From a paper:
Using a series of X-ray crystal structures, we evaluated the stepwise accumulation process of Au ions into the cage and the formation of a multinuclear Au cluster in our designed cavity.
Thus, in our design, four L169Cs were expected as the main fixing residues and four R168Hs as auxiliary coordinating residues, which yielded the mutant design of apo-[name]/[name]-rHLFr. The apo-[name]/[name]-rHLFr mutant was expressed in E.coli and purified following the same procedure in our previous report. The resolution of apo-[name]/[name]-rHLFr is 1.5 Å. The mutation of [name]/[name] has a negligible effect on the conformation of the whole cage.
Residue numbers in the entry:
A (entry chain A), B (entry chain A), C (entry chain A), D (entry chain A): 1 to 171
The structure:
């Protein structure tokens, strides 16, 4: 029961529970990515740190959604967390491509829930996503795109390596 | 006259004036609640403080709306402030039930004005309410619901009292 | 591949991966317990905090095991995380009984892996568990047993309540 | 003579003296590695520092074992220290491969002495090795494996170099 629920549709409540699952699955995927890069035969500790930090950010996003579900009077429901899609993640370029696909999927789930909230005339839900999630995703996807371009630059060629070093070491 | 008004409907202007009245009436109701709990034959000073703080928060909400009305070029109009609905407020449980009814009514008035602003394509009004009022109301109603559950727990039974004390004194 | 693996059996490697699953499932169970107690119709915020802290401790235990798996040259493998066994957790007493069952199961899994490590003459694994997990579990189970006794004391009777308050408020 | 010896086998005493020899031989090997990298025709001062630090760590391990031998009432006996196996150590990759072989040999000698101590029911010896040597060796061998992977990455190819620089300079 709840004595607080007001203007909070059953459709939003259930979509919030699905989005918590998506963010906890993404956290799990980033935990697997992180520990893969800590393998002695892979040994890229900054790439491990990058993904382990993202694991923490996705768990915190799930926790914020769960706090909001209770603030609105909905009821958290948990489902199983699917294991990540790979057991080994390839090169840094493979891993960063998998990470941008994952973030694009989270961003589309946020936009779909925003559209539901707008259809349901739920401005608290719409502002919650705008304030705490939509720009976080735009900023992260921009960073990951910049990283993809620099990984390819570096692995690709002499001119690319040189251009990267000039930026990093002179400018 | 105004030389600043732009995209601000007469419908929103008048609804903002009505909402100022509602928030100043709510402030008045909480002033009455506060002083009732300060009576020597009632004597629950933390309950008096809880409501007197809410009186101040509702007056500040009215003042923010009035500042916004002038920022947009509308004209504040004041109406009489109806006296509160009761002269004596019963138990803490009665008073907290009356407070959650009052907040639900303020929250629905905010949602109604947001819907008007959206219909009028007034995004400054819609963001103003989202930023300064809708989450304040969700947070307060969640707190008041938590309080209702704990008041009933405590007044209700042995097991309830014990469970409350374990949470408060051990955890 | 690994060029570091030494004295680390495939049996231990696989049992470490199963134990990571058990600790991440326990973290998930405590996340569900935590948010249940944050419901407005339950509203025991110290009980929510108690379980949310335990969610964090169990995730950190899984992360320590995963770091160890890579330190030894084994390979992390993740499986799906089963959803928790309940969607609603009852009273504080129900929840604390479920938590002690969960910890007893983690403790027996630690003792089983210690016995495997001893059988495999793997003293690094055995000391790792002794140093970082076995006394943490004994201490937590002792605390949870103390809590069960005090919850029952408090919910049970006049004499019990009084005895608890004397300890908390005079001594 | 000793008036303190208790539960300390002649087999452990003699194996501790052999292990002191092994650790002082390893210190000697790392002193030779260090000064080879300080040659003007080799000139890799960070590699010289890496090995000179390991020379100091292995001498300190021998000193800890000798303190323990006297704490237990055994008698230190020293043997000649064989010169290191090479006079010149090749590339950084050659040297790091020689260092991981050396550490694996020290780790197996520790595991063999732990097994002797366990067979002799000498828990003080077994805990001494667990506490002060077995995890130090696991951690060092993990670091050396990470280093081998990064040396090969860097010397091997364009893509490898680029991937290393992205990790070091962007992440």
């Amino acid at each position: 029961s709840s004595q607080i629920r007001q203007n909070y549709s059953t459709e939003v409540e259930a979509a919030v529970n699905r989005l918590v699952n998506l963010y906890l699955r993404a956290s799990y995927t980033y935990l697997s990515l992180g520990f893969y890069f800590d393998r002695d035969d892979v040994a890229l500790e900054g790439v491990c740190h990058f993904f382990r930090e993202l694991a923490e950010e996705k768990r915190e996003g799930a926790e914020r959604l769960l706090k909001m579900q209770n603030q609105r009077g909905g009821r958290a429901l948990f489902q199983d967390l699917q294991k990540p899609s790979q057991d080994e993640w390839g090169t840094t370029l493979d891993a960063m491509k998998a990470a941008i696909v994952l973030e694009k999927s989270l961003n589309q789930a946020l936009l779909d829930l925003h559209a539901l909230g707008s259809a349901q005339a739920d401005p608290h839900l719409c502002d919650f996503l705008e304030s705490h999630f939509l720009d976080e995703e735009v900023k992260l996807i921009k960073k990951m795109g910049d990283h993809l371009t620099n990984i390819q630059r570096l692995v690709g060629s002499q001119a690319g390596l040189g251009e990267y070093l000039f930026e990093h070491c002179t400018l």
